[PDB]
Each structure stands twice: as structure tokens, then as C-alpha cells.
Amino acid sequence: QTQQLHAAMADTFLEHMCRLDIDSPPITARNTGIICTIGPASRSVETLKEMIKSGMNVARLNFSHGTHEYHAETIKNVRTATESFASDPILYRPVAVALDTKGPEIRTGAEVELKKGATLKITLDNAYMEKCDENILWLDYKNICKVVEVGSKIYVDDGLISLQVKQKGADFLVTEVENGGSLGSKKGVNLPGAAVDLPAVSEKDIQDLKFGVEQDVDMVFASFIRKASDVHEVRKVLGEKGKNIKIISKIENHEGVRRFDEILEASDGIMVARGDLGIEIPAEKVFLAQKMMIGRCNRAGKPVICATQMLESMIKKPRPTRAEGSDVANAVLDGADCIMLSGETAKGDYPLEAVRMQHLIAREAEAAIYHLQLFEELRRLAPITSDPTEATAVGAVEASFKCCSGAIIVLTKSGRSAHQVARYRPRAPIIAVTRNPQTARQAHLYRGIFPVLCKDPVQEAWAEDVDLRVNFAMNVGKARGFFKKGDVVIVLTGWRPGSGFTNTMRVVPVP
Amino acid sequence: QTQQLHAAMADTFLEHMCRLDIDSPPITARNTGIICTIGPASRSVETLKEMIKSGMNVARLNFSHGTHEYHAETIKNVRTATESFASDPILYRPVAVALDTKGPEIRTGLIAEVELKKGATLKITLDNAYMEKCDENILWLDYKNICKVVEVGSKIYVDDGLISLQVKQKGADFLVTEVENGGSLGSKKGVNLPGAAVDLPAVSEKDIQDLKFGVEQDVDMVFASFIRKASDVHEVRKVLGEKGKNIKIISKIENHEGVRRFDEILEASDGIMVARGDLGIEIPAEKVFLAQKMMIGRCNRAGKPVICATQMLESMIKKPRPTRAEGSDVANAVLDGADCIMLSGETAKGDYPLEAVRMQHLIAREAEAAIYHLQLFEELRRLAPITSDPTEATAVGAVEASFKCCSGAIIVLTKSGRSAHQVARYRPRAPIIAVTRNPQTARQAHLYRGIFPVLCKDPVQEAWAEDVDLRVNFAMNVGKARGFFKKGDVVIVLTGWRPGSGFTNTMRVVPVP
Amino acid sequence: QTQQLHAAMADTFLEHMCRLDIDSPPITARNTGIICTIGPASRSVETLKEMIKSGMNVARLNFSHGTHEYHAETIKNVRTATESFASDPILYRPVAVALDTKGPEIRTGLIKGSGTAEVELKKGATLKITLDNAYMEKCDENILWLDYKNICKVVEVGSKIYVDDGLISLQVKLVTEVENGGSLGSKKGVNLPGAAVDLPAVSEKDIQDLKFGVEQDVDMVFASFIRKASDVHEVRKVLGEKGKNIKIISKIENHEGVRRFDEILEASDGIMVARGDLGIEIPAEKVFLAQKMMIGRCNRAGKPVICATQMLESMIKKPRPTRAEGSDVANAVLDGADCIMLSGETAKGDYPLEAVRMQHLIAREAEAAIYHLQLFEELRRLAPITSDPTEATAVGAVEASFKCCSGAIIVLTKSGRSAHQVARYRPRAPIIAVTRNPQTARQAHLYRGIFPVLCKDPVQEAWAEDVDLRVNFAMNVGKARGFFKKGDVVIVLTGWRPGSGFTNTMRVVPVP
Numbered sequence A: 001q002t003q004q005l006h007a008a009m010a011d012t013f014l015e016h017m018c019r020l021d022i023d024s025p026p027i028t029a030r031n032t033g034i035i036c037t038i039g040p041a042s043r044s045v046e047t048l049k050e051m052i053k054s055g056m057n058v059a060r061l062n063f064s065h066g067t068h069e070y071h072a073e074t075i076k077n078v079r080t081a082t083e084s085f086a087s088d089p090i091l092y093r094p095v096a097v098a099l100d101t102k103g104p105e106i107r108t109g110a111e112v113e114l115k116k117g118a119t120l121k122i123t124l125d126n127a128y129m130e131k132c133d134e135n136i137l138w139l140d141y142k143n144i145c146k147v148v149e150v151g152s153k154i155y156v157d158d159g160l161i162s163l164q165v166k167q168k169g170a171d172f173l174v175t176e177v178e179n180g181g182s183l184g185s186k187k188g189v190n191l192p193g194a195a196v197d198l199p200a201v202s203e204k205d206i207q208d209l210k211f212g213v214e215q216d217v218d219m220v221f222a223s224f225i226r227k228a229s230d231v232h233e234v235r236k237v238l239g240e241k242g243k244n245i246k247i248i249s250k251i252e253n254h255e256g257v258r259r260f261d262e263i264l265e266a267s268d269g270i271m272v273a274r275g276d277l278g279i280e281i282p283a284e285k286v287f288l289a290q291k292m293m294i295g296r297c298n299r300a301g302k303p304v305i306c307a308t309q310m311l312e313s314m315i316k317k318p319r320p321t322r323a324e325g326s327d328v329a330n331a332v333l334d335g336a337d338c339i340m341l342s343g344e345t346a347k348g349d350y351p352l353e354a355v356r357m358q359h360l361i362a363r364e365a366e367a368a369i370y371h372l373q374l375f376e377e378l379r380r381l382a383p384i385t386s387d388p389t390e391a392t393a394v395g396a397v398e399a400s401f402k403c404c405s406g407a408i409i410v411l412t413k414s415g416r417s418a419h420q421v422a423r424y425r426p427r428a429p430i431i432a433v434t435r436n437p438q439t440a441r442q443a444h445l446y447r448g449i450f451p452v453l454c455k456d457p458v459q460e461a462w463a464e465d466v467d468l469r470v471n472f473a474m475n476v477g478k479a480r481g482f483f484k485k486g487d488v489v490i491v492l493t494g495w496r497p498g499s500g501f502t503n504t505m506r507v508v509p510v511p
Numbered sequence B: 001q002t003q004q005l006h007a008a009m010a011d012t013f014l015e016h017m018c019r020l021d022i023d024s025p026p027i028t029a030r031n032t033g034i035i036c037t038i039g040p041a042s043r044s045v046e047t048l049k050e051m052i053k054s055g056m057n058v059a060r061l062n063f064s065h066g067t068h069e070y071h072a073e074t075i076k077n078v079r080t081a082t083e084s085f086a087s088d089p090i091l092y093r094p095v096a097v098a099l100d101t102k103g104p105e106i107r108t109g110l111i112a113e114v115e116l117k118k119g120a121t122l123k124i125t126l127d128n129a130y131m132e133k134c135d136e137n138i139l140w141l142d143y144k145n146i147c148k149v150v151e152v153g154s155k156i157y158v159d160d161g162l163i164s165l166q167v168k169q170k171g172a173d174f175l176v177t178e179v180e181n182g183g184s185l186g187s188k189k190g191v192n193l194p195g196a197a198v199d200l201p202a203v204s205e206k207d208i209q210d211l212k213f214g215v216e217q218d219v220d221m222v223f224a225s226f227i228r229k230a231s232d233v234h235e236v237r238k239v240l241g242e243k244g245k246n247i248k249i250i251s252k253i254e255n256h257e258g259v260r261r262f263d264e265i266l267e268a269s270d271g272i273m274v275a276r277g278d279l280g281i282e283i284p285a286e287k288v289f290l291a292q293k294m295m296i297g298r299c300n301r302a303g304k305p306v307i308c309a310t311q312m313l314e315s316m317i318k319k320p321r322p323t324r325a326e327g328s329d330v331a332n333a334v335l336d337g338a339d340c341i342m343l344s345g346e347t348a349k350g351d352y353p354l355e356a357v358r359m360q361h362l363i364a365r366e367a368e369a370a371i372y373h374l375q376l377f378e379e380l381r382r383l384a385p386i387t388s389d390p391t392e393a394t395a396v397g398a399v400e401a402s403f404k405c406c407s408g409a410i411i412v413l414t415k416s417g418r419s420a421h422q423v424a425r426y427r428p429r430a431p432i433i434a435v436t437r438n439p440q441t442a443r444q445a446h447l448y449r450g451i452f453p454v455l456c457k458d459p460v461q462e463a464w465a466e467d468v469d470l471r472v473n474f475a476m477n478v479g480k481a482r483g484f485f486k487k488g489d490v491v492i493v494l495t496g497w498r499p500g501s502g503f504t505n506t507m508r509v510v511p512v513p
Numbered sequence C: 001q002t003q004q005l006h007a008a009m010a011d012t013f014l015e016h017m018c019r020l021d022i023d024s025p026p027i028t029a030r031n032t033g034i035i036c037t038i039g040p041a042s043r044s045v046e047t048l049k050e051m052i053k054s055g056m057n058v059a060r061l062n063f064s065h066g067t068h069e070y071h072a073e074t075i076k077n078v079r080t081a082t083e084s085f086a087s088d089p090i091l092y093r094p095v096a097v098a099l100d101t102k103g104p105e106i107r108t109g110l111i112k113g114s115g116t117a118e119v120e121l122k123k124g125a126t127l128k129i130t131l132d133n134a135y136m137e138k139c140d141e142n143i144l145w146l147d148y149k150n151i152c153k154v155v156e157v158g159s160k161i162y163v164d165d166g167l168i169s170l171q172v173k174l175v176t177e178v179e180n181g182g183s184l185g186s187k188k189g190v191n192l193p194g195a196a197v198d199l200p201a202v203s204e205k206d207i208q209d210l211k212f213g214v215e216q217d218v219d220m221v222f223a224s225f226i227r228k229a230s231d232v233h234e235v236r237k238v239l240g241e242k243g244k245n246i247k248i249i250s251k252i253e254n255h256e257g258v259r260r261f262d263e264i265l266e267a268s269d270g271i272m273v274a275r276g277d278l279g280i281e282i283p284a285e286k287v288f289l290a291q292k293m294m295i296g297r298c299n300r301a302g303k304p305v306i307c308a309t310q311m312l313e314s315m316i317k318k319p320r321p322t323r324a325e326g327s328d329v330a331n332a333v334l335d336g337a338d339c340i341m342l343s344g345e346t347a348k349g350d351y352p353l354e355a356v357r358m359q360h361l362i363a364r365e366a367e368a369a370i371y372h373l374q375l376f377e378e379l380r381r382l383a384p385i386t387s388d389p390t391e392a393t394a395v396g397a398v399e400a401s402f403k404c405c406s407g408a409i410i411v412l413t414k415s416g417r418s419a420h421q422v423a424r425y426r427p428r429a430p431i432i433a434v435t436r437n438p439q440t441a442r443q444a445h446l447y448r449g450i451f452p453v454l455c456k457d458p459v460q461e462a463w464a465e466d467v468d469l470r471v472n473f474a475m476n477v478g479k480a481r482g483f484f485k486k487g488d489v490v491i492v493l494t495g496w497r498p499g500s501g502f503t504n505t506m507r508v509v510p511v512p
């Protein structure tokens, strides 16, 4: 059989694992979104066209480096490459734009070798900003000594250098060098366990967010989110003009993990930013934090992105390591809506191969999901409500499993009716048909959603305009190989025009 | 607080049982069909009007005794009482007519009675000179293949298992038997042969005659007696012909053979009666429950109606309240998954027939709310096959949707019954309001748990979309008047894409106006 | 293909039901207790010997009828028939004695002077219930007397008054309307379901009867109409020091008792679902809710539950039961009732040995039909994770007994306790409880699974010899009763030192 359907019939989680078959081929549809960071290796129109063809859904722009001119030129080239496929709306793929903020930073003020088990004093004394050595160190954070206790740890430069504070004061701390390594200039400082009172948006962040509103970006990946106030501050900065732009909170430290629930409720989605998280928490604990956040986002129905070092060896090599193949599969198996590439697409030698590998692994892992347990648990956990769209969404997903459907076709203006289908995790691809260009770009955040942008003019009778939109989605799935003529599909629509009225589920053969 | 909703939220079967609460009131919907047997206690037009008000759905006619003229007058009385409520279509309840066959039987001859002594020796003859010479030593019976179908050491029961026998010696013409249980041996008494593959025909010559008579009398269904194998149901269907092609055949499972060959019988039938009366005569009386829960579960799994039957409320023949065993039996049958429950002597000949119908209605309604729907609905789709039928996928989608929004009802437009029947096998908590213009469809829909059939008598509109909207709004009126929901509750609506039967593919989540 | 093991291997509850097989025979062991009420039909030592053989575990004495002399002579005859098998301790079956109390009953007077005279009542007639005590022996068709003096002080006009197991229904318009007629007899139960009857918990008759129970060495008390936890505490304090080891089973018989169930159960030693009175006090259609609630909560708490009343009611006059009756017995066992009961079927009926036998047969077929895979998983999950070694041993023993499909679980016990802890996890395997305490042996019949054996062998001086003597005694019992043969595998529960509270040892042994 195909698409692990023998494993799909299994009575237990263990027997499901036992029946996983490498000779069982998957369907064409790949459900997990792929976020690629664009930099020097993948910035040209020519490379970006191939990036789309290899399977990029979201172009991430990291505002830790680079000016507004560099980033606008990148955004222009993304759109140039995307709109070159716009002549055929049947085969057109919407490509999202994401702004990743720099965030609040703690920085040090040429290599000095710290001895393993020596005395290093931190200072706030401003004349030692060019005078950093093995005895004296300066930081740009001014409230360091209040948020750090006696015996608290201080990490410098990606956690390569670890200090531990022996005596606390007001203008100073005196530490002990626990992990050594060479100390340098302008290097990142992390504080594990602490509740850092640095602002939610920096002064750079505010200008960069406003630039996001100008450049019509679809989502904000917001760095170092510690609490619900922080999301609300990003939201306030985005204003009324940026109010449909999704805020994806990056969970990057202990405080963010501990306050996950208030952050999730305030945000439009989550990034497991494992890079900084693995600097701030113990590296053996990052998987616990990953599975927790993915689980709870699956429970809430909000997007979750797994990020950082997923195919890290692909920067230099054309094949990944076996850890890396396993990381991508297990993130998709956990339930991550999106998977991310950073230096793999931004600076490395094989960006096209890394996108391809993420596409190949995800499709293979989506087939291996135990939907029998998963649909049972998601139903049980989600409450009894009186929203008609929610009842329609769960009925559609139920119907799709009963007929082993080719797709669930959903008409949507804002995204939501399709978002509500996606949260019950069907096997069948969700074709979200929309006239709204931002909705089509934002749908890549949600597992299972295959967004199509309908460019056909509005028909004169409303029921006919709905049928035309359903037909357009019939034509897409036939041309992308999702289904053929006479395959049974699920069709979701509503009773009147406008958002909020999806109430109608139809089971139809493809004409 | 209501309809056992706290118990419904429980994570285990045990905690579900622990949370069952006597101060948690059920909804006014009662889902289980009540089949009342009509006889001398309930026959008049006046009494039958009260029977429908008390909650009768199916009037059962037992063709074991009584002339065709007598039975047709019963049927006419049923229909007169039923049609007295037709002036209010919103309040009108459809009433089915059922024909229960006599079946083939083995009878004794003529003695006037004698005395069978316990531990003594008796002799069976097929010799027709001893036909009217039955005594305490010699017994005649009317089934000539009896020596072929029993072996040595096997049991023979006489007079509803009052007298037990055991054959010690057998011949080609005759049997020699020791008396196991003593008792009064009378004339023309029933004979059961436990464990025997009896070769009595599917349809007897009296049964042939009565089956064509039901076609003439327009009966909705047939309760066919003593069904042992697939070819037996085919014979019933053959005898009914194309004139009776829409009449439902419910097989009565009455012996060991019918129980053992259950899967082929079920596949050939429209539904199954657990005919416990004769079943406990033929099989040991402590094994009836095993056969009850087997047949109910398989019928549930197949999606075909199952009737629980015989002595459900027995003491109510003489008494106005049932016993505690009787209360429990009706409850646990509904909990097992029986689509219909039956009354025999309680409504045929007993002193309190209205109280018996009212008691089955009160017990079923309570037991329907105590169903653990969470485990049941989970198990029902897990055992359901993946097929490409649009209606089947719509049905399960509708039931899923109904649990998610705790809907007042699932409103189904149906021509032949079938779309509403497909909903019914997934066991929703919500009542299934089946709207039909077909009168028989409305009558036969009482066979399936959950279904509340309404017969629309408003004429066909010219625009079919308006005719669909009229029938949906009619079903809204019914549930409002019967207390199923009120304005602004959310219900599930099932329609199809074109007129005609077989096209139910549209599920809508709709506010009550 | 035996014991419904095809059914046992099902992955769902529905498929377990589908696989239930009439040609799959059960084991010889019957786990559910049978309590028989002894009256005129079962009184004689002759009938009582055949009761024990047909499967009686507990003799119930109903003190709503009869004098203390009648009951003492009944008790003596129970003990004569029980001790007539004491000569071989391998084949001796311990028989418990239960006292069922009268309680706060309301009863009618005598029809025309006698207990056995009956009048006929018709639907729509009128009869006047009076309170003056001259009419206490000349009750007829017109005038009735009842002993509760505060009858007018609680009820209203339009309230329903039920006489003789709810069969005669009246309605106060006291001048009443006969809602439901039938046969009216002498000294019949009266119910007032609307009323808040302020009759005392333990009446003066109850005190004399409870005193008598202490003097006659009864094993348990079935206490009538328990409303609240302080009713249980009142019976406990009436029994005192002298009756401290007598178990208190609280009969739940009205609406208040159901409502305050959790506080009753924590105070009691066990529960009776007293369905007869319960079905008049609450709507009869709600009895099964109340039955399954109580059986479920008692299974969850590990305390005994008895299903009682009209389980085989037609067998008072018939040698076979109705289809409802066979279903009720099965479903009560399937629900999880530790004991089943017969009342008038064994007390006064024409076929009393056939009722005991029919309960034995149905229960044994139903015990095979238990979906053990779901049940044990649910009982484990709802068990607290505790620091008690005895609880860990018992649950390991049950788990081990499922894995080897065990012939028995052999448990040495002083007080009953270690064997009770096995019983609450519901194994398929019979629990052979070996004890030297004879009261423990009688009281163990309250718990599903437990086959109690009384060791009459003297104490060996080395303690490990004495332990192995009791283990091999139990081994001989199941060999003699056909529970297992030689080479079959049993579970043995013992402890690390003598005295109660130290069971920590689970052994998986071949039968020698």
C-alpha cells in the first residue's frame, strides 16, 4: 500500500511504528510549511525562483544584520521571483514574507584567554568599554546586578564561556570562570534563569517593525518574548495599519518557557527558537521545551515553528547528517506546522538542496503520523462550543478520514475556516481558496493548508461564484496531482457572503 | 446538570458509571421504538388512541392465532386511531403495522391429559395409528424427520420446556426416551428440539397465506419466525414478491442454529428480533444474555435494526408497576444498543397496557442519556469501513458535528429512510428528525434508534430549493412544539444536491429560527 | 474457546460484545456471593444442606418479620447444616449469617384480625386511613391503620401513598382515592416518597434486634434506610465494643441515601442497593442509574456491594425465571456487584433450590463475560499511587494471574484484608483465602472472587512450615473442587513476618 496506510490501520502506537514502511510511497502533497532565511547565498531573482520551485513557502528576513535598503531589495526580489509564476494561477504558489526582529541584546565591550577556574569581575564602569581583559569586563545592560543572584550563571558568546557569580553588589559583580575560552569584543551575553527587564521592543525594533508595515510583510517573528506584555507592545507598535500581520512569538529563554500559556494566548503563533533556547537552558532539555510548546500549540490551534540547526551540516555538505534527517522528521511528527532553514539558505553552499531535503523529509513524515490516535485525542481535548464553523471543521475532518479523501476544499476570506480545519490534523491536504492575497500568504503558517489565490472575476449569482471557486480548486489538485476525476473530496463553504459564516460541508466526486 | 452530561464528560467507563445521577433529567426525546402487541386489552379505537399518546410506535399483529378478518379489523382500528391526530401534522405521530408469522412448529397428537412421571421411560412414535392414542408410554408427533435430526443422549422438550426428555434409544421409525423433568402431558403441545438442525420449511402453508395477506393489508414490516439460515429470509422475500418489495424483513432468531448462523441471516435480513421467549426454551436460560449482547452488538456494527423482545415487563400483566428485574432488563437492553423494545402479553391481554407502554417510554429515555457516547462513537468509527460512499461520510460527519456543538437535533430529509438510517448507526445523542413525504418511510423509521419521523403534508413547491427550505422549517416547528430545542439553538441539517433518492451529501450547521 | 477468551482478546468493548459466545463454557469457580433469605420454605436443616450445595454463601435473616425465638432456631439450623460438612476441612464451605434490620418502616394493621386474610381493592374506589388505635386489627376495604403517628404532619393533599411493595397506589384528597387496586393484605410496607419522614435512625425494635445479633455471633448487619453518615455511626455505636468486628452494610433505599452516598460509603463496611424500597422512593425508571452509580463507586473505593430484590421474583411460583430475570442477574454481575441476593425466592417460595442454582449458573456465565482488559486498566488508573507494600503486592498478583491465566490466587490472611485488596482489582482467577479466623472466613463472602477456606490444622512451631502447610491446604482445595490440576500455575500471597499487615510476597508456583 501507499502513504503508510497499513500503519494507519494499527490498533496501537507500537504496532503503528512496526508497520512503518520505506517501500510505501507518499502522496504528492506536502503539508508542513518551509521557512527559508534569505541572505547572500539565496538573494538573487534566479536563485529565489529555484527556491520557490524546490518548495519555499515563507521568506524570512533577519533584522539582526543588514540595513533597510538591503532588506527592501531582498523583498523586491522575492516578489519578482514569485510573480514570474503568476501567469498560470492554477500552478501559482503564494510566497509569504516574514520579518524576524533583532530583539533586546546584552553585549560585551583581539582575544583574551580566560583561565578555567579564575576570577573575572563584571563592571558597569564606562571607561572600561575599550578596556576588557581577563580581570575586567563591561556590559551594556545597566540592571544586570538586580536580576542576577549570588550563584547565578552568566554566559558569554553563544554559551562558549560560562561564568558563575560569587558576590553581588550594585555597581559590580565578581564571578568565577566555570567554562573557559577566548574572550572577545562585541559578543552576546546570556543570563540563565533571570527575568530580564530590558524592553520588549528596542529602539531599532520599533523602526524595523514600522518598516515591516510599509513593506507589506505577512508575519512578524518577534525575538525574546518573555511575557504577554511583550506581545502587546509589538502589537501596539504595528498599530491599526499592521493589525492583520501575524505576531509569532520567539520563545528563547527560561522565562518565556515558564510563562508559555500567557504568551500563546496573546500571540498569533510560536517559534521554538532553539538556537538561543539551547544557550539559555541546558542543551539536554531543549526537546522537552520543543514537545511542550508544539503540543500546546496543537491543543490551541495556533501555528508552531521549529527552528535552528535542522540541517546545519548542509551549509558545507550536499547531504545532511543522520541526526539532521531525524530532527526534521520528528519535528513534523511532533506536530510542527512549520520547519525553518537559517544559515542553510542564508549563507551556505547548498541552499536548494536543503529546501528539497526539508520537502522530502516532511512529506515522508506526514504519511507516518498516527492519525487514528491523533484525531481521537484532539477531539476529546477540544471543548464543546456553539461556534458553527468549529462544528463544521471537525465534521469535515471526520468525513475526510471516512472516505480517505483527496482533499478538503475550504473557501475562506480571512484564513480562519481553513485554520479551524488544520487544527484537527487531517491526512487530506486542505486547499484554501481565496481572493485575498495576504490570506493566501499567511496560510503557509498552518499545517495542511495549500493556499490558492483565485484571480477569476466575480460571477453575477453568488452561488455560481462559490461553485467557480470550488472548481478552481478542483483544477489545482488535478494539476498538482493530489487527486483525479472521480476521487471523492470534502467541500467547505458558507450560507451567505462575508467572514464568520462557514457552516456547510459537502462530499463530492471530482468532475 | 441535565441529560447525564456530567457523566458524558468522564474519561473512563467506570467513572461514567460513578457519575450516573438520578437528579439529572433527560430531554423529552425518547429514541428507542416501542413495539406493542395488540390483542383483547388494547384493540379498540379509544384504547389505541391512548396507546399512541402513551408512546406506541409499532403495532404488532401475532398471526399465530386469529382469523384474517379479525386481524384486518385490528389494522383498521390501528389506522383509525392513528389518523385521528392528523389534523395537527406538527403533533402527528406515524404508527407502523407489523406482521408476526406463526412459523413452522412441531406439535404432539391427541390423548384431555395424562401424567408423565419423573425418572420413567417414554416412547416416541411417527406411526399414524397412534396419532390419537397418546398416553404415558406412547407419544405421537407431526414432524416425520425427527429420527434423522436427533442422536443418542440429546434432549427433547415438550410444552414450552415443561417436560424434558432424553433419548436413550433411537430407531428409523421411532425413539425410546427417559423422562428427565416430569409433568402434565396434554394434547397438541409444542415440541422443541434443542441443538437440532431441523428441516421444517422457512415458510409454512399457513405462513404463505398470511404473508400475501400483509401485502394486501399494506403492512410496513414482517417479523418472520424461526429463521435458521440465509435461504430462509430469501424464501420470505420471494413469497412477499415485488408487490411487497419495500416491506422490511425482520428475522426472529429462535434457536441454537439461528444463533450459530447469525452472520449470514443478518446479511440477508432488514433487521433482527432477539426472540428470547423461544430462544430460552431452546437454549439454557442463563445463556440468553450472551446471545442478546452478541446479536445487538453485531447488528450495531452492521447498522441494521435489532428488537429486544419477550417478558421485558412481564409482571405488569397483573400489576401496575413492574419488578426491579424488569426495570433493569429494559434499561440494559437500551444500553446494549437495541433499536426497539417489545411488549407481548403486557399490551395484548394484561390489565395495565397503557402503564406498560408508559414504563418502556420512561425507562428508555433514562437509559439513552446514560449511554457512554464518548467511548461508543469512538469505537463505532474505528470499526467502520473506509468506503467511497458520499452519504456514509456525510452521516459520520453530521454525528461528529452534533457532538461538537451538543446540537438539539439532526434534521434529515429522506425519501426511502436510508439517509436517516445511516446517521442512526453512528448513535448520536441528538434526536434524528427524519422529514419525508412518503407515508411508509415515516412508519418504517421507528425501527432505527434515534429517528423521530415526521410526515410532511404541505404540497410540493415549484422551486425545489424552496421545497427543501419548507421541509427544514417544518422540522424546526416540530422540535419547537415537542420541546427538543428552541429559537437560537444550533441543529444539524442533512440535504442532498438534487431531487430523488441517494444524493444526501450536504451537512449544514443551522440556527433554529 | 472456553471462558469467553475469544471475547477477552477484543480490542474494543463493542467487539467484546460481538464475540460473546453461547458455546463457550465457563470455569468451575463462581466468584459472586449468593445471599439467601431464610424463611418457612428454606428453614429446615434438610433444605439448608441442599442450599449450601446449590451455592449459598450467606444466610440473611429478615427481622421485619418474626420473633427472636424463630430467628435463633433458624440460626441454629443454618449452623447445623454448615457444620455437617466440617469433618473434611478441604470440602467445608463457610456460611455467613447476616441480620437485616427492620429500620424506620411504616406498616399496615391486620385484615379482620389475622396475618393471612386478604381483601380486594378496585381502581377508582375510596378508602380512609385513620390514626385511632381501635381500628388496628379490623382493617378492611374501607378503613386502614398504620403505625406512623405523624402521617398527617408531613404529607399534602395530592401526595401519593404506596402500600405493599408499591403495588397499591393511593392519593390523598386522610381520605384517599385508590389509584391502583389489587390484593390488600395484612402487615404490609407503606411508602411516602414526597414526605420528609422524621422517624428515628435506630428504633427501639432495631436495638433489641442488634443486641440479639451480637449475642448470636452474626457476621454482618444489613442496616435499613441509611440516610447520612451519622446513621452509620449510630449503628456502629449501638454495636459497641462487643460487636466491633461485625460488618455494617448500609442499605440505600431512598432519595437522601443516594444523594449522600459518598459520606455513607466512607463510614460503612459495604453497601446494599435495596432496589425494592428504592424503586418506590424514587421513580422506578431511575433505579438502574442508582444501581450502576453505587456499584461503580463501591468498586472504585474497594468496598463490597450487594445487588438486591426481585432478581428472580417469578421463581416464587415457577421452576424457571423470566427473560428479564436472567438478564438482571447477569447485568448485576457484569456491573460489578460483589454479591447477589434472593429474598422471597428462598424465604417462602415453591422452588427455593432452583433459585439458588439459577443464580449460580447466570453469575458464572456473566463472570466470563467481563471485559477484563478495559476493567483492570481502569481500576489501575483510578488507584492512587501509594507507599503501601500490600497494595503493590496485590496489584502485581492480579497482573501475574492474567499473564499465566491462573487457576487461582492463594492468599494467607488474618483479618480478610490482604484478600480484599486482591478482590478490588477484579481478577478472573478465584481468590483462595486461607485463614484460621472463622469470622474472617464468613465475612470474606462479601467480596467478589474470594473463596474462603478455614484451616483447622494446629500451629507448627516453625512459622515457615505453618505458612507452607496453609499454602498446600489451599492447593488441595482447588484440586478437590476442580479449580486446577497438578502442573497448573497459581499465584501465592504471603508475608515476611507473622500477624496482620505484612503481605509483601508474591509467588508464582506450580501445583504439586
Ligand SMILES: O=P(O)(O)OC[C@H]1O[C@](O)(COP(=O)(O)O)[C@@H](O)[C@@H]1O
Pocket (backbone or CB within 6 Å): A411, A412, A413, A414, A415, A416, A417, A418, A492, A493, A494, A495, A496, A497, A498, A499, A500, A501, A502
Ligand atoms: O474563513 P472566513 O474568513 O470566515 O471566510 C469564510 C466565508 O467564505 C464564504 O464561503 C464565501 O464568501 P465570499 O463570497 O464573501 O467570499 C462565506 O460563505 C464564508 O463565511
Ligand SMILES: O=P(O)(O)OC[C@H]1O[C@](O)(COP(=O)(O)O)[C@@H](O)[C@@H]1O
Pocket (backbone or CB within 6 Å): B413, B414, B415, B416, B417, B418, B419, B420, B494, B495, B496, B497, B498, B499, B500, B501, B502, B503, B504
Ligand atoms: O434517504 P434517501 O431516500 O436517499 O433520500 C434523500 C433525498 O432527499 C432529498 O434531500 C430531497 O429529495 P426530494 O426532493 O426528492 O424529496 C434529496 O436531495 C436526497 O437525495
Ligand SMILES: O=P(O)(O)OC[C@H]1O[C@](O)(COP(=O)(O)O)[C@@H](O)[C@@H]1O
Pocket (backbone or CB within 6 Å): C412, C413, C414, C415, C416, C417, C418, C419, C493, C494, C495, C496, C497, C498, C499, C500, C501, C502, C503
Ligand atoms: O490480611 P491480613 O490480616 O493482613 O493477614 C496477612 C498476614 O498473614 C500472614 O501471611 C501470615 O501470618 P500468620 O502466620 O500470623 O497467620 C502474614 O505474613 C501477613 O501479614
Ligand SMILES: Cn1cc(C(=O)c2cccc(Cl)c2Cl)cc1C(N)=O
Pocket (backbone or CB within 6 Å): A017, A330, A333, A334, A335, A368, A369, A370, A371, A373, A374, A377
Ligand atoms: C510515528 N509517530 C506518530 C506520532 C503521532 O502521530 C502523534 C504525534 C503527536 C501527538 C500525537 Cl497524539 C500523536 Cl498520535 C508520533 C510519532 C513518533 N514521534 O514516533
Ligand SMILES: Cn1cc(C(=O)c2cccc(Cl)c2Cl)cc1C(N)=O
Pocket (backbone or CB within 6 Å): B017, B332, B335, B336, B337, B370, B371, B372, B373, B375, B376, B379, C013, C014, C017, C292
Ligand atoms: C452505562 N453503560 C453505557 C454503555 C454504553 O454506552 C455502551 C454500550 C454498548 C457498547 C458500547 Cl461500546 C458502549 Cl460504550 C453500557 C452501559 C452499561 N451496560 O451499563
Ligand SMILES: Cn1cc(C(=O)c2cccc(Cl)c2Cl)cc1C(N)=O
Pocket (backbone or CB within 6 Å): B013, B014, B293, C017, C331, C334, C335, C336, C369, C370, C371, C372, C374, C375, C378
Ligand atoms: C459485557 N460487559 C462487560 C462489562 C465490563 O466488563 C465492565 C463492567 C463495569 C465496569 C467496566 Cl470498566 C467494565 Cl469494562 C459490562 C458489560 C455489559 N454491561 O454489557
